[model samples]
Target chain A: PHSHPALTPEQKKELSDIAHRIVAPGKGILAADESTGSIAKRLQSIGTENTEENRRFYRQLLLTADDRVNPCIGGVILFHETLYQKADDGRPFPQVIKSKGGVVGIKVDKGVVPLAGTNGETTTQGLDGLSERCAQYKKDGADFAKWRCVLKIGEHTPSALAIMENANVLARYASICQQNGIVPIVEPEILPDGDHDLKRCQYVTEKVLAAVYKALSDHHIYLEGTLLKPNMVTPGHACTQKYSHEEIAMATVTALRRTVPPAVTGVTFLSGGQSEEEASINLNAINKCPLLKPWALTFSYGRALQASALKAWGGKKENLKAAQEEYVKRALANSLACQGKYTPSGQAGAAASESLFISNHAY
Target chain B: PHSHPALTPEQKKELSDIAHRIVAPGKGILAADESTGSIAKRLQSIGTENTEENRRFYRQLLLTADDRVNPCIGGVILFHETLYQKADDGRPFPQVIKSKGGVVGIKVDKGVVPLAGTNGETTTQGLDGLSERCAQYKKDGADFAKWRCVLKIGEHTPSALAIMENANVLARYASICQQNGIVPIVEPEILPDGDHDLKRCQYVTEKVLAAVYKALSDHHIYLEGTLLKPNMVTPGHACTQKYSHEEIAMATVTALRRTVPPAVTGVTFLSGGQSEEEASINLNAINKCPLLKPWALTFSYGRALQASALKAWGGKKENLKAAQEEYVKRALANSLACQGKYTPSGQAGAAASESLFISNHAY
Candidate 1:
């Protein structure tokens, strides 16, 4: 085969430059749009009907929340269905958010597929025609792409097979997206299942992230143009043990600091079904932790950002203003948290409505 | 997620049974097929033409070498083009080899692709549409497949990037072939390209193979139905230092024994451009080495088996019988070597031609 040109000095500089710019100090991402299924469950918890209009209205509220969002939120990742949807005034959601000076991103993953011979685990599978899909998304004004690969807790959870397969797939997806100038947010979420404690979660998270970065390096991906969305280090769902916000934050930051290369633009924590208040709290603690973070420590929350907004919207027009206000509150809370300035007393609403669970969710 | 059915006790027994059958002691593959490009290079050294008719004439000679071939060569790997070629009397080559009781195998690689960001390195890339290709090849009466991924030695030779990419590709290829009931000979060759010593080659080979088996585990591939075709440990091309046959055998066998799981059916060393005598001597020594080898140790030689035959043919119909006899001699020598039955004194004829050298080669 003929030799292709190597990355010129200028190209490497450009990649690193862009990576540093997006992850500039005090910046993170705002994950405001939730999938229909995720929103449906959140609405169910708040005694409301689930509908597309309500979902749109809920996100519109988050997008139109005060202009302050632009300063703290460097980017806003939108669900695919919501990328082209309009605000109440006919402006595209992407345009509406971009107008607020935030980069417009899209979640491109088609969700998970069962890994044969694994212990109830899966890998993300949107890669079949991802190159074409990415080009189209780029044409529609998406500045970045996101794919989430989920791992969970079990006797043999995150088996070596699960780790390698998912890591390779993520790298392949990122490579294609970058070819089209779209930054990729790689989310390999180790689920908060089982009764495992914080240290166990930290061990697995460290191993998983290490493998992910190694795979990315193997694929020759430009690391600077990529972002990592990982779950915060926390005890498993069934664990009776409680972790202080400081402990969780320290564990999470240490893990990222050790495994994630300084080249990546940012580390955005997945809400991982955390309640809005708890998500914001943990993120605040993470940012507050005294660690040498090479990348921006921020939030890319889905349910945590939308649960309350959808609850207040209740698929009703009259509730739009209240829903928007709720969105504004959560956005402001996370915004402060991004800067390590948020306090427990700063959380405005009651703790997230109970029962925010969804089974094998997809967006 | 629901738990998928685990491998049944009976199925496990069946797989183990097949594993033992393929790797039964003292049995291994005989690699007689060299690509047109490879043979051209070989013929260039012998000052002969490398035309299709010449290649067909040469292979025809090898396939019909002798009845003793089946007892020594458990299998014979054929090139895609040659698999359809006929003997002088119009009988198919596969028929001729199968009639001798050898399993018919085919090389399925489309050659290598340059790995981006590496120093003139590459990985095998025929996996783009490998599944469909494997099905058709199997229908053509081939029972196994081979794909070669090349690695070279340098300041950062066999970079983590190269090893990981090649390993994952091999796993994917193996998985696809197994779905079609074809055993895959996974070959990730590290070329003897620099001044590095044998130890370095052994170190890199061990690391690469470890990654490969780990990948195989991740892909949930049935190792019992797979084979490993790896480069034997040897010093770099520019290294003035030399190692004894016993040293090479110990290094090669130890590397495989440590990294290659016991489940794999066999370990077939690529000739890596070794001369016929060198290849035979090394195989014999490898078999003689006192090591706890879990898989059958044998040779999957191409040029080592064909160079002398091609020289004997010299592209002349008049030399066909002599070339056929020469082919049989090399095959028989390697066969005896495979079973640790050949003595160094038994290696006669053109001893000077047995120097092992290739610009960028991996066994």
Candidate 2:
């Protein structure tokens, strides 16, 4: 009805700068913000009890890895627990991450909620009290926020209701975060479950992001102040045929270029259960992808970044330094990979090379 | 990835035929399906008790109007209660409507649901068992269903969530209806609230219909089986600027021409708070407007058709003939208006003279 800009020019510029910084050249986010339930699975996998002390210790190991990770990891997303948890010397995890030159971010979505009349589909929750929480998080060391809403491809799944609901929710979340001076990572991750082909993934991704940006426009969300976190276009995990990283990059970049407006600050691809090395290689190829990409392309990986580190830690405090070394290794490799400078030096089938897929992935 | 049509050719044909007949040459719909709470207000205006008998009497009066209305009204929509209610002779409302050569339509929506984080926006409900309900309605002699979803224009009022959610639900409704041999009237009514200009209304209507049709395609809904019930493009109810009926017609037709696909059977414009004559004149102008409108343009009016009739009844049994006469006049005028054949009867402002404005109307 009227032209009411949701953000002032200065506010827009602040968010844009923060978004750009998080995906700066050779840098990307470290998604360590696994929900309490999600983190319990990782600890359980290592035969460790899911306790507060253990969670704090694990998060601290990633936060205080080494200075070598400072330039590699531009942002570190913390769960609510890690956001308040303190280091051995008593500094909060967010403060330690900031001290090491990584921007602090907190995952804000509560979780997914069931959508009635859908084929086992959902839309994300956590909009309740989001504005106040975002303001508080901004006041506390956080410069960005992450809210991941999931979608999947199937014969009749990811219904039109699901796509529209998730996109609108993401737009609302982004709009609220920007009003409070925090960059929102608009992550509408279409899951790689089913036996969908690369084309199907590409098609669904294009449609999803098209609806997303349209919703963003309707909400008057400032595209320049936001970052996109999408799954790289690849065949589903149950797919029979294999594809090269270049093919995946082609499909991913083509989808983004077709839908995402140039005003968005950057795009940080989610690992989406991809192997650590595979995720990095895909990011590398995506950067090398020949196209008119107007935004920075990088990684916002969770499993890919921690697979090797978690394996090294083995839930033992004495193995802390070993785990830190492993974390630094991945951070450095991904940094180069984001810049298209990584060479897979024959570390075949290593911890970072193993598949990390879980069916219908949550969190 | 693969083409699996949601409707078989026979199913699509049945639905298309029903929708086409409902808006055939010089014929339109009479929306008498006001929900319980909504009709209560209507009854209160006439000093009638809000009881089932009164409701039945009022609906039966409309359905059993003279044969002059038979040719004018191709369809009659009934609320859930009225669908089961009978005439004094013990015939169901649907049977009476069918006997008069009008298709029986059922209003299938439950109500609106609040969308979190929106500026008081809502999405329509009632999809939980919609498929089964459609099957039963079809067996009960209902050939079509009307589902109304409302949107408003404001600084941030009809947020992205409102448009997407409403559009998607309408598509899902259409899909379910088509699957069960019933034509679905897809109504995305943008409220005539606020002081927005004609251009704003046109813009929002275009965006909303575009999303609606896209969702329909994504859900594999048979567009040829659907009738669009949209608000005629006009300035907001509170706007100071005045526009000619031709201008409103052009805006309305242009918006539909740009977004609605060619396969849709017809478009029956909702008379959103429009006076009777204004609604008729607008439909006439829209039909005569210079545009490539591919579908039937007609009325699916509620208040525009019944305001005078209800006033004439005034809760008196002796006024039934007067009410029927009033209803017949409007029906004849609209039947000619749909074909651009009406001469204003020399009382140029006769029908346009009433103030039928209601804030955020629900029917």
Top TM-score hit: 1
**Residue-wise lDDT of candidate 2 within B4-56, one digit each (tens)?**
45666787788888988998998999999999989999999888999998898
Residue pairs of candidate 1 with colliding backbone atoms = A161-B218, B270-B363
Candidate 1 has an lDDT of: 0.77
Q: Candidate 2 at B308: error in angstroms?
A: 1.2
Report lDDT (Cα) of residue B223, candidate 2: 80
lDDT (CA) per prediction:
0.77, 0.86
DockQ of 2: 0.04
Model 1 C-alpha lDDT per residue in residues A128-181, reported as the tens digit of each score: 456677789888878787888898877877787788788887887787677666
Specify the CAPRI tier of model 1: incorrect
Provide per-model DockQ scores. Answer: 0.13, 0.04
Count residue pairs with overlapping backbones in model 2: 1
- Which segments of candidate 2 are over 4 A away from where they belong? A1-363, B346-352, B361-363
At residue B318, give the lDDT of candidate 1. Answer: 90
**lDDT by residue for model 2 (A1-363), tens:** 545466677987899888888989889899999999999999998999999999999998999887999999999999987888899999988889888888999999988755544566777767656777898999888999999999989988777768877887787788778889999999999999999989899999999999999988876788888899999999999999998777788888889988999998889989999888889888887877666689888889999999989989999999999999988888988888887677677332222333334321111
Candidate 1 per-residue lDDT over residues B200-259, each given as its tens digit: 888999999999998887676888778888999999888889888878888888788779
TM-score of each: 0.63, 0.58
